[PDB]
Amino acid sequence: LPPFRMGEVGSLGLKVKNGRIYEEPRQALRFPESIKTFQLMMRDPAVAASVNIIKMFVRKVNWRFVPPKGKEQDPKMLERADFFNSLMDDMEHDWADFINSVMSFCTYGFCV
């Protein structure tokens, strides 16, 4: 066996093939067909309600910027927190809308 060495030796072992992930064996749940299958499932009242309750719970919460622990009262960190807080409300769209768009991953499993 090779000796111990710092740095990676193997790989994740993912089943990517020509740039498309092939983890899921069923054809109905892979990339091209999953856009339609998931939209078919959302029509059922039970699945729709289960997804919507989770989406509602996340959107109920508020967000805020705070100084890192150990330096709570440092004026410099307070000014940094104020700057980053002001950054949230200066966007072309509201922060709540951004959080709303993020929750699309409750259906497709990811978001970009």
Partner: protein, 122 residues
């Protein structure tokens, strides 16, 4: 369209002709009046001719209520109730049918808020 139990009259074919004798025409008119005006009443009763053919042993006249054999294969009430409950679940508005339970509240400042109020907050 449920038609079980309606009266039915059976007459020889020659009674329904257009050239029939006046007696048969009067008989048919009276039968029509009976069919139109018969109702459950303290004077309900019938006097009807009865003759059994010697060679067939079946009455040539008859008076009976239509009967049905089978029963509907599905219970529509349960299905309708199930779908109504499914509709009410989509909006999380079951309070309409279950009333206002003491474990739920409509106040957003109270730690018992229901899902309907939570969504109205959104």
């Amino acid at each position: 369209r449920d038609l079980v139990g309606m009266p039915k009259i059976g007459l020889p074919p020659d009674y329904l002709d257009e050239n029939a004798e006046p007696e048969k025409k009067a008989f048919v008119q009276y039968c029509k009046t009976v069919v139109n005006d018969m109702i459950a009443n303290d004077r309900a009763g019938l006097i009807w001719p009865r003759y059994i053919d010697p060679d067939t042993k079946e009455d040539i006249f008859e008076f009976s209520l239509v009967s049905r054999q089978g029963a509907k294969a599905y219970d529509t009430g349960s299905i309708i109730d199930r779908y109504s409950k499914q509709i009410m679940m989509a909006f999380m508005s079951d309070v309409l049918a279950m009333g206002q339970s003491k474990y739920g509240s409509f106040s957003l400042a109270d730690s018992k808020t229901s899902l309907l109020a939570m969504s109205v907050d959104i």
